[PDB]
Amino acid sequence: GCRHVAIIMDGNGRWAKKQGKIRAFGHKAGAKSVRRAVSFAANNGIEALTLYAFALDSEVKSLHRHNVRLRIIGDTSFNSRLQERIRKSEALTAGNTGLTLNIAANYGGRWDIVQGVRQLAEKVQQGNLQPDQIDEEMLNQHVCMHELAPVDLVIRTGGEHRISNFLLWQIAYAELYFTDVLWPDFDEQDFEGALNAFAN
Amino acid sequence: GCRHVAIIMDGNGRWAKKQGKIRAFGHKAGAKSVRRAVSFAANNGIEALTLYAFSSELMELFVWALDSEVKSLHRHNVRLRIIGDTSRFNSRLQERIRKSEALTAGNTGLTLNIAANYGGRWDIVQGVRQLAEKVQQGNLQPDQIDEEMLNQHVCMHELAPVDLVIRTGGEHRISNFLLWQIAYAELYFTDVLWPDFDEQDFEGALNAFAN
Ligand SMILES: O=C(Nc1cccc(Oc2ccc(C(=O)O)c(C(=O)O)c2)c1)c1ccc(-c2ccccc2)cc1
Ligand SMILES: O=C(Nc1cccc(Oc2ccc(C(=O)O)c(C(=O)O)c2)c1)c1ccc(-c2ccccc2)cc1
């Protein structure tokens, strides 16, 4: 019963340079693998896919047309026009009922926790909330994706075995799956394999 | 070149099940493997070792270890720390904890951290609450609260960062152990059950980290 999958997409650059091709060539194949993995998730009743990449404006109409709700997690506070274009893609797809897609942009798991500290750190400095009252269930309501299904499964491609300051709070009970396959190569069968690991 | 290792010790019960023995046999065997992992770490230049048992489904009866192992660890120059929500506990064994720490705090060999009802989420909530008082006490502008700062209020802030997390026993989860602290740590999962995790398995992990 897997509902929320998070992916550290790695090996974009490696994959390209192995073929004697540039940094961007990998990111075009990487963008194609992203889509691949998005249909796969939508078609298998995954409710939430969170992608970490460690311009989108050309994917938006396509994602909208595929019933995908687009949300950006991270520190965007980015030049003012871009921030408004991000809001416009969010709003556009806000009514969609299919897969929820979260793209990490200048995101950090520690930053995420911080942000949430401060939402409470002035829910206090306006005598609204007691230190004593501060608990987990609370702080959780103030971290990214608290409205979404809890993260079940975290996938990292590219062969490294670390979280690298992707989700920290959210991954307390997630399954963690590391494959050497580089992101541009990661396909439906790679994805199913991770899903079966969860299932066992 | 790895300074701080944290270990989720799992597979004690499966280890005994395998031989048709009750859980308790595995626990006794796991106790031995802990001693073995503590020596290894002291004699292989590790500065800090952080140990988290893992149930899930008798755990308390880490009182046994506290009462039986402390004076030996002191003699071996091991600095003993208990991390976790201990406020929960009975007064008298809260004192035993406090007295074991006081005994060993000036030891300059291995720092040994023992997780007792620890949760990575609890750790963070605790760090925060400290700050949330520092706000309702003047002192601190919430403008000011950043990563460096909350870091200083989570467990083990005064030690080298966690470099390597080992989890034995087959499962691929943190299970709410360290969270904030494992941000950049290497994660190492082996199917060896804890009672069988020896020097050679620990060496494998350290050699894996080194690349
Ligand atoms: O608790 C410690 N080790 C330990 C070993 C074995 C089992 C175990 O708990 C389990 C695990 C699995 C199961 C199951 O069912 O799988 C069960 C069950 O359900 O009964 C119980 C815990 C420990 C205690 C104290 C120190 C220490 C303290 C102070 C100073 C120095 C060191 C270090 C480690
Ligand atoms: O770690 C435990 N004991 C222990 C004692 C003394 C030294 C020591 O490690 C060192 C450090 C430095 C040196 C050195 O400097 O050489 C040496 C060396 O000389 O080999 C050895 C380890 C322990 C912890 C928990 C349980 C337990 C768990 C659950 C239930 C019951 C018991 C059992 C044993």
PDB file of C-alpha atoms and ligand atoms in Angstrom, chain B residues 9 12-13 23 27 53-55 57-59 62 65-66 73 80 112 114, ligand 1:
ATOM      1  CA  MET B   9      21.251  -2.855  16.286  1.00  0.00           C
ATOM      2  CA  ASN B  12      18.629 -10.130  18.035  1.00  0.00           C
ATOM      3  CA  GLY B  13      15.294 -11.965  18.047  1.00  0.00           C
ATOM      4  CA  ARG B  23      14.175 -14.119  21.958  1.00  0.00           C
ATOM      5  CA  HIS B  27      19.393 -10.613  23.557  1.00  0.00           C
ATOM      6  CA  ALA B  53      18.740  -1.050  20.096  1.00  0.00           C
ATOM      7  CA  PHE B  54      15.363  -1.384  18.169  1.00  0.00           C
ATOM      8  CA  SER B  55      12.545  -3.607  19.332  1.00  0.00           C
ATOM      9  CA  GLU B  57       7.082  -5.608  19.384  1.00  0.00           C
ATOM     10  CA  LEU B  58      12.505  -6.213  28.378  1.00  0.00           C
ATOM     11  CA  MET B  59      14.122  -3.454  26.407  1.00  0.00           C
ATOM     12  CA  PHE B  62      19.100  -1.794  29.716  1.00  0.00           C
ATOM     13  CA  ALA B  65      23.841  -2.934  31.407  1.00  0.00           C
ATOM     14  CA  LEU B  66      23.881   0.315  33.377  1.00  0.00           C
ATOM     15  CA  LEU B  73      33.818   1.267  30.909  1.00  0.00           C
ATOM     16  CA  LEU B  80      29.349   7.446  28.741  1.00  0.00           C
ATOM     17  CA  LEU B 112      29.808   6.055  23.934  1.00  0.00           C
ATOM     18  CA  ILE B 114      23.408   4.971  24.320  1.00  0.00           C
TER      19      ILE B 114
HETATM   20  O1  LIG C   1      19.255  -2.777  25.255  1.00  0.00           O
HETATM   21  C1  LIG C   1      20.398  -2.977  24.799  1.00  0.00           C
HETATM   22  N1  LIG C   1      20.727  -3.966  23.975  1.00  0.00           N
HETATM   23  C2  LIG C   1      19.826  -4.866  23.558  1.00  0.00           C
HETATM   24  C3  LIG C   1      20.281  -6.147  23.251  1.00  0.00           C
HETATM   25  C4  LIG C   1      19.371  -7.115  22.818  1.00  0.00           C
HETATM   26  C5  LIG C   1      18.008  -6.828  22.701  1.00  0.00           C
HETATM   27  C6  LIG C   1      17.534  -5.554  23.008  1.00  0.00           C
HETATM   28  O2  LIG C   1      16.200  -5.223  22.924  1.00  0.00           O
HETATM   29  C7  LIG C   1      15.366  -5.987  22.172  1.00  0.00           C
HETATM   30  C8  LIG C   1      15.674  -6.183  20.834  1.00  0.00           C
HETATM   31  C9  LIG C   1      14.832  -6.960  20.053  1.00  0.00           C
HETATM   32  C10 LIG C   1      13.676  -7.539  20.583  1.00  0.00           C
HETATM   33  C11 LIG C   1      12.869  -8.357  19.561  1.00  0.00           C
HETATM   34  O3  LIG C   1      11.803  -8.929  19.900  1.00  0.00           O
HETATM   35  O4  LIG C   1      13.353  -8.385  18.402  1.00  0.00           O
HETATM   36  C12 LIG C   1      13.343  -7.343  21.944  1.00  0.00           C
HETATM   37  C13 LIG C   1      12.079  -7.949  22.618  1.00  0.00           C
HETATM   38  O5  LIG C   1      10.969  -7.859  22.035  1.00  0.00           O
HETATM   39  O6  LIG C   1      12.217  -8.482  23.743  1.00  0.00           O
HETATM   40  C14 LIG C   1      14.204  -6.552  22.725  1.00  0.00           C
HETATM   41  C15 LIG C   1      18.454  -4.588  23.442  1.00  0.00           C
HETATM   42  C16 LIG C   1      21.547  -2.124  25.318  1.00  0.00           C
HETATM   43  C17 LIG C   1      21.360  -1.799  26.639  1.00  0.00           C
HETATM   44  C18 LIG C   1      22.286  -1.022  27.282  1.00  0.00           C
HETATM   45  C19 LIG C   1      23.425  -0.561  26.635  1.00  0.00           C
HETATM   46  C20 LIG C   1      24.244   0.170  27.490  1.00  0.00           C
HETATM   47  C21 LIG C   1      23.646   0.852  28.560  1.00  0.00           C
HETATM   48  C22 LIG C   1      24.402   1.549  29.490  1.00  0.00           C
HETATM   49  C23 LIG C   1      25.784   1.550  29.366  1.00  0.00           C
HETATM   50  C24 LIG C   1      26.388   0.865  28.309  1.00  0.00           C
HETATM   51  C25 LIG C   1      25.625   0.159  27.375  1.00  0.00           C
HETATM   52  C26 LIG C   1      23.663  -0.904  25.298  1.00  0.00           C
HETATM   53  C27 LIG C   1      22.699  -1.689  24.637  1.00  0.00           C
END
